[PDB]
Design a protein around this ligand. Structure first.
Ligand code: VO4
Length: 574
């Protein structure tokens, strides 16, 4: 089959001399390829799950052979429960081959053709070409693996066994099912996106030029409530969003939110848009909304973590260093598991409240002096395609980006505290990074004038090229913040979807109404001064809960970390 020409990644090639990073890289490649061909594990919550499973398998394969001191393996070989019983090395002592077997097995189980009946219903939507392209990635990775892959080694086979365990235990085949779900129209209620009310998909995925059919998508409406958690030791909840349930009386907040939404997230040329060119860059930088050759947010968060990992490694040798191998194996397991659970809980709350997107909220507002029936947002970029911007097919509260980021970057902060610098676990850190380039703005990817051609490299395809922006960040606190507000700039999330408006915006004398600059643009607090302290109430539960995705993610990361990466007790599983 014709292999898809993938654009070059902006990262020192030395990174892949380390087999832990190499396998992480292979996971990231499958991520972007599956989103280009429409293969399995697409979308934000599930794509994060794939990475969590991959790194959990790698983590235990490595630490079984090279036992850790300050912590232990996720699963143990002495568990009476067969489902949580980790296999034993029994002679195997080649960590490199162990990791290879775990990674290869997991990724293959995740991305290959479900010959075991699973193809029906679940996989009945993915074309043969999709699987073929994914297979190519897998096949060549074996050949590019640093140190090679010896499929006949005992260590390799051990790794495979480890993968089988984690796969059977955590795989959620029907995770993204939407069968039986239908929106419940009304104020504040999620429903089909006005600029993309329906989509025409081929009746037969193997004949994309053949007859089409109308399709309305709702992304994983049942996943969050039915899926198995990874390492969280409890259920997490967010305060009711402004306008709903116990907070239905927070009208000043909601009204100002509508106001900030129009000014900060509208289309580039609308007279009501007050967003600056720089803020537009900040919005697109963190997108990764499932585009061709790009993939989803988890892929970007891992690209960032890869840089942090190498920038702050203990030993200079990337290839032959167990200190580095252990460090990376541990870090990525912590990070990707937190990302996985962040997805579960953000999706759980998303479909719990079913809060509507700013596009619908502004248009359907109804009040002549508050709404704008013809508003358009900067929207989620439709990169490497000729389609227009959209709003991802799922409820708004809370922001998945914000939750993912909160978890990933809080985990990084907990892990490096006292090593890169010293800070209170709830205050700004000093984990700075340089030369960080997003594939949304790399001088290569673009907005095409014609349909994407998968047989030709992106450079030979006409379109407006995205300006190359090289960033530097002073801390993971900043990363966490900007990643969250970027969605406000795109106009796909309300301010409260990120965090409590009181914690991120500059207040005025009027309660719930925040400050704007000379030209009407919203003013944010300085990153160093931001503290996610503002909590709210829930109708169905007593107490105060976090508002927005960031606080939720931070909470999930602290929990997992504090428990040293321990499985969710099967008793509290759904
Ligand atoms: O991922 V959002 O849920 O931030 O579009």
């Amino acid at each position: 089959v014709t292999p898809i020409p993938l654009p070059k990644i902006d990262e020192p090639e030395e990174y892949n001399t380390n087999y832990i990073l190499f396998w992480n890289h292979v996971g990231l490649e499958l991520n972007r390829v599956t989103h280009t061909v429409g293969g399995p594990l697409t979308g934000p919550p599930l794509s994060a799950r794939a990475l969590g499973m991959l790194h959990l398998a790698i983590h235990d394969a490595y630490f079984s052979i090279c036992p850790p001191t300050d912590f232990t393996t996720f699963l143990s070989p002495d568990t009476e429960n067969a489902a949580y019983r980790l296999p034993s090395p029994n002679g195997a002592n080649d960590a490199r081959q162990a990791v290879a077997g775990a990674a290869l097995k997991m990724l293959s189980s995740l991305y290959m053709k479900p010959v075991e009946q699973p193809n029906p219903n679940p996989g009945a939507n993915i074309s043969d070409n999709a699987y073929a392209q994914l297979g190519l990635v897998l096949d060549r990775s074996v050949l590019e693996a640093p140190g090679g892959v010896d499929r006949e080694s005992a260590s390799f086979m051990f790794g495979e066994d480890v993968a089988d365990v984690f796969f059977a235990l955590l795989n959620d085949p029907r995770g993204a099912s939407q069968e039986g779900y239908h929106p419940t129209p009304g104020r504040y209620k999620f429903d089909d996106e006005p600029t993309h009310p329906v989509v025409l998909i081929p009746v037969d995925p193997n004949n994309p030029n053949g007859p089409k059919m109308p399709f309305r998508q709702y992304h994983a409406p049942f996943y969050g409530k039915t899926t198995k958690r990874f390492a969280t030791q409890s259920e997490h909840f967010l305060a009711d969003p402004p306008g709903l349930r116990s907070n239905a009386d927070e009208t000043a907040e909601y009204d100002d939110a509508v106001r900030v939404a129009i000014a900060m997230g509208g289309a580039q040329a609308l007279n009501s848009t007050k967003r600056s060119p720089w803020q537009t860059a900040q919005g697109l930088y963190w997108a990764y909304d499932g585009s061709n050759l790009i993939g989803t947010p988890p892929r970007f968060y891992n690209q960032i973590v890869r840089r942090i990992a190498v920038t702050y490694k203990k030993e200079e040798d990337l290839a032959n260093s167990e200190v580095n191998n252990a460090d990376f194996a541990r870090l990525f397991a912590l990070v990707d598991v937190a990302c996985t659970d962040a997805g579960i809980f953000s999706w759980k709350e998303k479909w719990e409240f079913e809060f509507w997107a700013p596009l619908s909220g502004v248009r359907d507002d109804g009040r002549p002096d508050h709404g704008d029936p013809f508003w358009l947002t900067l929207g989620a970029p439709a990169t490497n395609t000729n389609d227009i911007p959209f709003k991802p097919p799922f409820p708004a509260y809370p922001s998945g980006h914000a939750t993912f980021g909160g978890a990933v970057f809080q985990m990084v902060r907990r892990y490096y505290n006292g090593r890169v610098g010293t800070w209170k676990d709830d205050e700004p850190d000093n984990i700075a990074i340089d030369m960080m380039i997003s594939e949304e703005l790399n001088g290569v990817n673009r907005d095409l004038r014609q349909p994407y051609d998968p047989t030709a490299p992106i450079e030979d395809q006409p379109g407006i090229v995205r300006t190359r922006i090289v960033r530097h960040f002073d801390s993971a606190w900043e990363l966490m913040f900007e990643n969250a507000i970027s969605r406000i700039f795109l106009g796909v999330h309300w301010r409260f979807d990120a965090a409590a408006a009181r914690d991120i915006l500059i207040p005025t004398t009027t309660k719930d109404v925040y400050a704007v600059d000379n030209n009407g643009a919203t003013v944010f607090q300085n990153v160093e001064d931001i503290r996610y302290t503002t909590r709210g109430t829930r109708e169905d539960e007593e107490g105060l809960f976090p508002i927005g995705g960031v606080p939720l993610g931070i909470e999930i990361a602290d929990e997992i970390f504090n428990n040293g990466l321990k499985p969710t007790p099967p008793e509290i599983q759904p």
